[PDB]
Amino acid sequence: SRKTYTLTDYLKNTYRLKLYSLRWISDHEYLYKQENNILVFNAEYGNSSVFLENSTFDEFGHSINDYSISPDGQFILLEYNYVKQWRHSYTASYDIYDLNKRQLITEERIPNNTQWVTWSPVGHKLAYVWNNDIYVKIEPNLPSYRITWTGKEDIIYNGITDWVYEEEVFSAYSALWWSPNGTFLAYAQFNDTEVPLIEYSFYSDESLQYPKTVRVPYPKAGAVNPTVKFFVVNTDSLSSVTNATSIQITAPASMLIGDHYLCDVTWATQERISLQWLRRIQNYSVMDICDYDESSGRWNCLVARQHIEMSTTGWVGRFRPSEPHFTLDGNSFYKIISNEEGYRHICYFQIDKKDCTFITKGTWEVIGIEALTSDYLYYISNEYKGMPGGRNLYKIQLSDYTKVTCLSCELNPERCQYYSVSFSKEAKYYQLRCSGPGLPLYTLHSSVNDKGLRVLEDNSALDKMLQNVQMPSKKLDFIILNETKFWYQMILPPHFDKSKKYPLLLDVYAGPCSQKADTVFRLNWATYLASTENIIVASFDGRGSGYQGDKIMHAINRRLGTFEVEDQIEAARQFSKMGFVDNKRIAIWGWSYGGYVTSMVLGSGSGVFKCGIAVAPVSRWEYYDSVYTERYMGLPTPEDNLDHYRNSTVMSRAENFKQVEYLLIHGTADDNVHFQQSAQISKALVDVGVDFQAMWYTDEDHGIASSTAHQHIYTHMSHFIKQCFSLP
Amino acid sequence: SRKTYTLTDYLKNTYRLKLYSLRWISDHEYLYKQENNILVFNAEYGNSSVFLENSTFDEFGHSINDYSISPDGQFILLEYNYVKQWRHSYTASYDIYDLNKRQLITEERIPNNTQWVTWSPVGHKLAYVWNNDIYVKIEPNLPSYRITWTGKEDIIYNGITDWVYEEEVFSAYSALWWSPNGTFLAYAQFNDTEVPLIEYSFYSDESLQYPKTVRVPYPKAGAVNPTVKFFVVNTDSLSSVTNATSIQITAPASMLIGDHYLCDVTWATQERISLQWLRRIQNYSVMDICDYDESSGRWNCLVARQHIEMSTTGWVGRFRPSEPHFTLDGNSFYKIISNEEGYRHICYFQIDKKDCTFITKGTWEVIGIEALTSDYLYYISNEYKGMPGGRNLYKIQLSDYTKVTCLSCELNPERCQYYSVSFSKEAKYYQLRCSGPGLPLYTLHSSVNDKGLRVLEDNSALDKMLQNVQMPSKKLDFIILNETKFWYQMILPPHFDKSKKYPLLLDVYAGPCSQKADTVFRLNWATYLASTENIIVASFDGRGSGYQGDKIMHAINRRLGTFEVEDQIEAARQFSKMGFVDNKRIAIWGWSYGGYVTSMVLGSGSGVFKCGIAVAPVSRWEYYDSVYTERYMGLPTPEDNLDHYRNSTVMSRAENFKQVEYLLIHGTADDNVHFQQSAQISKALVDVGVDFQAMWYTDEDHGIASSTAHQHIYTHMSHFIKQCFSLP
Numbered sequence A, B: 001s002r003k004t005y006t007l008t009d010y011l012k013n014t015y016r017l018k019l020y021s022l023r024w025i026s027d028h029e030y031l032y033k034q035e036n037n038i039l040v041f042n043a044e045y046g047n048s049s050v051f052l053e054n055s056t057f058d059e060f061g062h063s064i065n066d067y068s069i070s071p072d073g074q075f076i077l078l079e080y081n082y083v084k085q086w087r088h089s090y091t092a093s094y095d096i097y098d099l100n101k102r103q104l105i106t107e108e109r110i111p112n113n114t115q116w117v118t119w120s121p122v123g124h125k126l127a128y129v130w131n132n133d134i135y136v137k138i139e140p141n142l143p144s145y146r147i148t149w150t151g152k153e154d155i156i157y158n159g160i161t162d163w164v165y166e167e168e169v170f171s172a173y174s175a176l177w178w179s180p181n182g183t184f185l186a187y188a189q190f191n192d193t194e195v196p197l198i199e200y201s202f203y204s205d206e207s208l209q210y211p212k213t214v215r216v217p218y219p220k221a222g223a224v225n226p227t228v229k230f231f232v233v234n235t236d237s238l239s240s241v242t243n244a245t246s247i248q249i250t251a252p253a254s255m256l257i258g259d260h261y262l263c264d265v266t267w268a269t270q271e272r273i274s275l276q277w278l279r280r281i282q283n284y285s286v287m288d289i290c291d292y293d294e295s296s297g298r299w300n301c302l303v304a305r306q307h308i309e310m311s312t313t314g315w316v317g318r319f320r321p322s323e324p325h326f327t328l329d330g331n332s333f334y335k336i337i338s339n340e341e342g343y344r345h346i347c348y349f350q351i352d353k354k355d356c357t358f359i360t361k362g363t364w365e366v367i368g369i370e371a372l373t374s375d376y377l378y379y380i381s382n383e384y385k386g387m388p389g390g391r392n393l394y395k396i397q398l399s400d401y402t403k404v405t406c407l408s409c410e411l412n413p414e415r416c417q418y419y420s421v422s423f424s425k426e427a428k429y430y431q432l433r434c435s436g437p438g439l440p441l442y443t444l445h446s447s448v449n450d451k452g453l454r455v456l457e458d459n460s461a462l463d464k465m466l467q468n469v470q471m472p473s474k475k476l477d478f479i480i481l482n483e484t485k486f487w488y489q490m491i492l493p494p495h496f497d498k499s500k501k502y503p504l505l506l507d508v509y510a511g512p513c514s515q516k517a518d519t520v521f522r523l524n525w526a527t528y529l530a531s532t533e534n535i536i537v538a539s540f541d542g543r544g545s546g547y548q549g550d551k552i553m554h555a556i557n558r559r560l561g562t563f564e565v566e567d568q569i570e571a572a573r574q575f576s577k578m579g580f581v582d583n584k585r586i587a588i589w590g591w592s593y594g595g596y597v598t599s600m601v602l603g604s605g606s607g608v609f610k611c612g613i614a615v616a617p618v619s620r621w622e623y624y625d626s627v628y629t630e631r632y633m634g635l636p637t638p639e640d641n642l643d644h645y646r647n648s649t650v651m652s653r654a655e656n657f658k659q660v661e662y663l664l665i666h667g668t669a670d671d672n673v674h675f676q677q678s679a680q681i682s683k684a685l686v687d688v689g690v691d692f693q694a695m696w697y698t699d700e701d702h703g704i705a706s707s708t709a710h711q712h713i714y715t716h717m718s719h720f721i722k723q724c725f726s727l728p
């Protein structure tokens, strides 16, 4: 008998996973922060030296939050006064420090309250955003150039995304795209004039006499959407006498015919951009290829180069149409696309020509394209052993598509079943990283022969640390439902005895393209529930789930809140018939989309579940945002899909909550799933006479991720599950 | 053997108190609604006539909420389309019904969305406020004259109170005061231009996509207040050709020197109004007498006539300076004033003479002057048997002040110890209203020889019904605290065995001038908690409580959240020492001020309470409204009382909540004690890692009085207390 993995261990971070975060700066070199010094490494030989000592900024006088070194290694960007906005957005103060003359820059500094900064991908050019306007510096010590004058808070965004495009489209605040040369700056402009605003209260510190009101431009399903415009600046033709001239590239004629989004920007060469556009009805997309006319100074998008991506079964792309990956000369590219059978695979496109050629096939899916050389394409997929929750790096010979080599499958087959990768420029070297089912492993490889050079980080210290803990095990398997294989995991208590009966918590998310049953090693709340409290934490991947074909993923099209809910219950039904699960003690919990499913399941009247927790749930799809909702639900009108918008609320199931113990939790400053959603749920339960448990977390957003609130929510939830399960 | 008083019985109102609401229309007649028919009654002989049948208004098209007949019995106002605003404020539609014509007047109607309406005290003149402006109708079928033109929503208020004035000062929406003749119309005007707005979300029906933001001008402790003006209109000189000319009465010079309030308006005779003003520091009150002039058509407020009312131990009045009761000629008046020994008694003022004379004295207080003739003044007081929580009607011979008759003491000593009264015009007849400790009893009397005429309602249908149920009993007594007497009450379970041990709930309000120990009979939550649950529910009036002189009441001056808290702990401590209360199971709950005292108690670390409930609590005095807070705390500035503003918050006691089980409950649409207050408590508890229980009520205000919310909250609090006491 040794110690168990405690709630305090999870919350206070007793056991930390080591990472190896490297930064490629050429084809054979990367940077890596050892302790606090920045060291430069040589990939081929493994030797290293100091780039920057831990003590270079001892008398800097600001809490340094992050850094970015310019491509040529001449300058360092320092980031302080970090203030978070949304998921990816923030403002900060910046400073530039010259690395050849060991001093700070004091002339013409970057402003306080900068929204976004980026180096040109070669050299030391700078682009930044301040008060919704784009500025450019050629030299760090020289005056910046004003590119746009239209910027205005909460209305016009130049070079930065608005709320919905940050969250749902680009997963970034940035709307800036340097050409590989650095010559051009491509950027987007967003117009949020007619976009309705979400208003909620923010209470701030005690000293604040009256509560503040937060106003965010946020389009709920069906409302008016932000418009978009695309521009390109020639940065080499900038002067301080004349104002900057930007060239506008307009959307294809088949997009201008209605409401539409800009969903992708990928530069092909020094003189060619690829843009993908999406129709407001997200089942139709057009890739447009645009070339720079040297003589005119203009950009042309020839109709001959237009490529359509469509779906008759659902929406385009997993969450959006995939990125292209161009060959060097920019005359051809590779792209993941759904094939005839609905499985996602690499297609070979030729710029001027029709159709495409699939270079992979099979009842599995390519997860991403990672690297391109003249001889090989490198991609991550889930082929190995027909395991959709597994991931390995593969490589295809471009002169013969039949020659496909797995590069990560047989390296550590017992510890490593889930990889990602980071390739150097020109793809000479790659860092492989596995994240389960054992402890994370970081290694360096070489593209010439795929020789394994170095172990970078093996989490050895953590190994010996957890050997003294009563750690839980993970079980990955599948069940049959209507002749189809659906996968689940269970987090299993230590000294698991199949002849004893354990209570079961169902961990749910089950949104479109989700995956909750995989091979990743996690140290979480579920880790504690299994190790200390001896509760089996199960997870299931039903209809609407990802990486197993459009038949499974598109089952939920226009029908959210149906099959993903039904299959959760059928999974719990099958788990309950198993000999080691106590059918008197089954619970369900979920966050975000998972809190919506949880509540739907609890209000279903199935009788399978004793209790459940829903954290920051969606309640009614008309409350959530346009880009996410409409992807799967259409418009909420009589002509379109109003009937199922109204069939699928938590509120309409209120009466069935009499049969269960319910815990509802929401942060009051939640800008994503607004408090409104839970507020509406509770009203319907109160109006119908159902007793339940509530918890609001004031000033917390969707993550509820302030250290104190984080600790408080998991503590509150732990007490609820233990009392639900008659555990002292 | 019998059934018990259940939660259902309370929540669903199974056992109902019968009432007798009457309206004196003359010196010998009253109106009364008997089975939806309005009847007129003769007081002396008891006969009746039907004024208006239930069948009339069968084809009206709208549900009638209220009615208001002319003083001359010629017209009836019909209130419909009722929409509640705050405690007293509301908006409605009105239809006039001509009686001699037996038809509704069809033109020149009172508009929809009318804010306030009144008849004149005699005749059928009408005054109404619509859109914040006053209008007057001389005849019901005639066009209305516009009186004010400056009314603007949330900014200028003519004839109606804004938020603070409605809640704290007048306890009315009306700021309209008719002359007894009906000649003059006096009104106030409020200017909220500079008053900060409190904003909170309103979610509405599930069909509302975007939440509504509610904005109310609400001055918090130390913020800018409304300014006020007083005007008087001559209703008899109104013209079609010219606008009405109002005459202004300016506040006294001692009030105009700083921030002040209008606190009282009382017409003395047909040509005399008395006003009372109050300094913002509610230490200093002035009464002003104003005479009309036949020639100039002006008013005069002679400085020699001004009476000043001060306090050095605290504030003036119980909540505001008390109203004057004038004699018929209006040359003299009577007013409840705090005496030299701290006890509130009646004072006789003569208009041209400087000082007043005390008519009553002793260690008790007058509750209210009720009626006046040439021969007698009638008042309610708590003198009888020395019980402060008892209420009785008394009679003072004006020629001999020592001749004081109790009129209600002996009517039924076992059943009746708490009286209120309603007097006919010229006090020819009075209705007495008994409230406890037995069942309520409504009687009619003649003033001539104080003869009992008739029993109007005796609630014997409730009495037969209550014989079938296991009813709890009340205990009214005192305990000793630092050599002074302090009163408490206990609701004790049926078949109370003093050798047994019972869990105890401390029911607290403890606001300045509160009384929670009295003789009245109540059917409430406590009734059910004793009868079914066998919980002793106790209440206690410590320092700061009313009706026992200024020594006890002003003990809390400038120091809210100190002595009223300690005395609740000390009382509870003494309650435990008793052999029938179990010291391991003591709870505390409160609403409003009571939630705050509860919160302060649980965070005191006294270790006397196991658990508690706070419902819509204050948490910091800066969050509450100026008029109320500043009355007892002064201003929150360094120069004044900021020290004890900061010392007396719930938030600073957060750590101590580790020892107790806490339950926090607030309505989201609380315009009175803003959700902000609870929101700050919860955050503080999280900030130091204290687990606790929470509940929000969507769209509920301070009352949480919607049928389903009412049922839900009490159901929820029952479950929290049952489990705290190990009660199955």
Ligand SMILES: CS(=O)(=O)c1cccc(C(=O)NC[C@@H]2CCCN2C(=O)C[C@H](N)Cc2cccc(Cl)c2)c1
Pocket: A167, A168, A169, A171, A319, A509, A510, A511, A513, A514, A515, A516, A592, A593, A618, A628, A672, A673
């Ligand atoms: C189970 S899982 O581990 O597979 C899992 C869980 C959570 C998210 C993902 C995911 O793939 N995200 C990526 C995609 C594309 C870019 C942005 N994005 C979103 O999904 C953003 C949505 N607005 C998220 C969201 C937030 C609040 C309410 C809802 Cl209903 C949805 C996967």
Ligand SMILES: CS(=O)(=O)c1cccc(C(=O)NC[C@@H]2CCCN2C(=O)C[C@H](N)Cc2cccc(Cl)c2)c1
Pocket: B167, B168, B169, B171, B319, B509, B510, B511, B513, B514, B515, B516, B592, B593, B618, B628, B672, B673
């Ligand atoms: C225990 S008790 O039975 O003695 C008891 C309990 C509650 C109220 C009273 C009372 O006398 N009310 C009348 C007085 C005068 C006019 C208005 N008024 C107020 O008190 C208005 C305040 N805004 C009420 C309030 C609301 C929210 C928070 C606080 Cl701290 C205070 C008595």
Ligand SMILES: *[C@@H]1O[C@H](CO)[C@@H](O)[C@H](O)[C@H]1NC(C)=O
Pocket: A040, A041, A042, A045, A047, A048, A049
């Ligand atoms: C590695 O060693 C070689 C040979 O001495 C040297 O030239 C190179 O700069 C070194 N690189 C690093 C990153 O230390």
Ligand SMILES: *[C@@H]1O[C@H](CO)[C@@H](O)[C@H](O)[C@H]1NC(C)=O
Pocket: A093, A109, A110, A111, A112
């Ligand atoms: C940012 O604000 C700081 C502190 O007020 C000030 O020293 C500095 O001048 C500001 N930065 C710039 C470059 O304007």
Ligand SMILES: *[C@@H]1O[C@H](CO)[C@@H](O)[C@H](O)[C@H]1NC(C)=O
Pocket: A150, A156, A191, A192, A193, A194
């Ligand atoms: C933003 O959009 C509105 C129309 O919704 C338009 O009037 C305005 O000019 C636009 N602003 C810019 C700079 O495009």
Ligand SMILES: *[C@@H]1O[C@H](CO)[C@@H](O)[C@H](O)[C@H]1NC(C)=O
Pocket: B029, B040, B041, B042, B047, B048, B049
């Ligand atoms: C009571 O009866 C008397 C005598 O007939 C009558 O004059 C009076 O109007 C009656 N009062 C009422 C209100 O019916």
Ligand SMILES: *[C@@H]1O[C@H](CO)[C@@H](O)[C@H](O)[C@H]1NC(C)=O
Pocket: B093, B109, B110, B111, B112
């Ligand atoms: C008042 O409102 C009613 C709705 O019941 C409407 O029919 C009427 O025209 C309005 N105006 C009047 C007559 O005051």
Ligand SMILES: *[C@@H]1O[C@H](CO)[C@@H](O)[C@H](O)[C@H]1NC(C)=O
Pocket: B150, B156, B191, B193, B194
């Ligand atoms: C209300 O007060 C403001 C100053 O706060 C003043 O300018 C305005 O004229 C006033 N309005 C009226 C009609 O009293």
Ligand SMILES: *[C@H]1O[C@H](CO)[C@@H](O)[C@H](O)[C@H]1NC(C)=O
Pocket: A149, A243
């Ligand atoms: C530069 O041009 C923009 C509009 O394109 C204008 O707002 C700005 O004033 C110009 N600067 C000057 C004066 O050259």
Ligand SMILES: *[C@H]1O[C@H](CO)[C@@H](O)[C@H](O)[C@H]1NC(C)=O
Pocket: B035, B036, B037, B054, B055
């Ligand atoms: C109206 O009065 C009649 C006769 O007195 C009575 O029976 C009936 O219950 C009343 N109806 C209503 C609507 O109260």
